[PDB]
């Protein structure tokens, strides 16, 4: 029950209510219907302060939904540079693959957040990493036509 | 966006070489018709 209030709080971005529900010992890895932890919702909507407060109380950094997408996927896809660095600092799997074999590097490369692409690479992201269709981050940059991104991946 | 229309895949060659829409055409936002051109005191303009 408390885990549901934490999901609602983490999404909306209530920095106070998250702390009060945590103090009463609410589940930090409380999954919703699709399998999203509060850390997923905080990473998606972009609530950096809540992402840290969750990880502080041992929030599962490599928790994955019913399709295998970690918060680092949602952070890297929606151009949340600060959240990506915080997640990677707390030991997030940089080569984390969903059911489709898609890594945070692909999602960063696809939307073209070059600041995040460099952080992922600097934390040891595999450029040669392929998806189910056999596509690298380099294949995306050429297809998309992003040539600023193409030189970074070589 | 012009990016997304540009990367439209028309076909793939026998050597795994892709032919995109931007490889056979220019992609840009442009008027439905270029028939009407208005000027206010010789200065580029539109109006209702």
> To the nearest whole angstrom, how far is the Cα of A143 from the nearest Cα of chain B?
6
d(CA A143, CA A113): 16
With CB atoms and an 8 Å threshold, state whether A143 touches B7. Answer: yes
Exposure string of A115-133, with b = 16+ CB inside 10 Å and e = fewer, is ebbebbbebebeeebbbee
**Of how many residues is chain B composed?**
48
Structure determination technique employed: X-ray
d(CA A69, CA A64): 5
**Best mutation target, A138, A145, A150, to test chain B (most B CBs within 10 A):** A145
CB atoms within 10 A of CB A106: 26
DSSP string, A49-98: HHHHHHHHTT--TT---TT---HHHHHHHTT-HHHHHHHHHTT--TT---
> To the nearest whole angstrom, how far is the Cα of B15 from the nearest Cα of chain A?
16
Which among A58, A56, A57, A90 has a CA at the least distance from the CA of A72?
A90
CB atoms within 10 A of CB A60: 14
**Best mutation target, B2, B3, B27, to test chain A (most A CBs within 10 A):** B3
Q: Which residue has the tokens 């885990």?
A: A3
> What resolution in angstrom units was achieved for this structure?
3.3
d(CA A79, CA A49): 16
Q: Which residue has the tokens 């949340």?
A: A80
d(CA A60, CA A72): 12
d(CA B21, CA A34): 37
CB-CB contact of A113 with A76 (8 Å) = yes
With vertex at residue A14, the alpha carbon angle to CA A8 and CA A15, rounded to the nearest 5 degrees, is: 130
Neighbouring-strand partners of residue B9: B20
């Amino acid at each position: 029950d408390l885990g549901k209030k934490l999901l609602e709080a983490a999404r909306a971005g209530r920095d106070d209510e998250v702390r009060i529900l945590m103090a009463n010992g609410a589940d930090v890895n409380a999954a919703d219907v699709v399998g999203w932890t509060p850390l997923h919702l905080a990473a998606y909507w972009g609530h950096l302060e809540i992402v840290e407060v969750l990880l502080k109380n041992g929030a599962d950094v490599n928790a994955y939904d019913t399709l295998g997408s970690t918060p680092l996927h949602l952070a890297a896809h929606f151009g949340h540079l600060e959240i990506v660095e915080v997640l990677l600092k707390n030991g997030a799997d940089v080569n984390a693959k969903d059911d489709n074999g898609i890594t945070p590097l692909h999602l960063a490369a696809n939307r073209g957040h070059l600041e995040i692409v460099e952080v992922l690479l600097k934390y040891g992201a595999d450029v040669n990493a392929q998806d189910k269709f056999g596509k690298t981050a380099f294949d995306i940059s050429i297809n998309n036509g992003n040539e600023d991104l193409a030189e970074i991946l070589q | 966006s012009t990016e997304e229309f540009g990367k439209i895949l028309l076909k793939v060659n026998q050597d795994g070489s892709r032919v995109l829409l931007r490889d056979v055409a220019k992609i840009e936002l442009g008027g439905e018709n270029y028939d009407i051109i208005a000027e206010f005191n010789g200065q580029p303009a539109s109006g209702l």
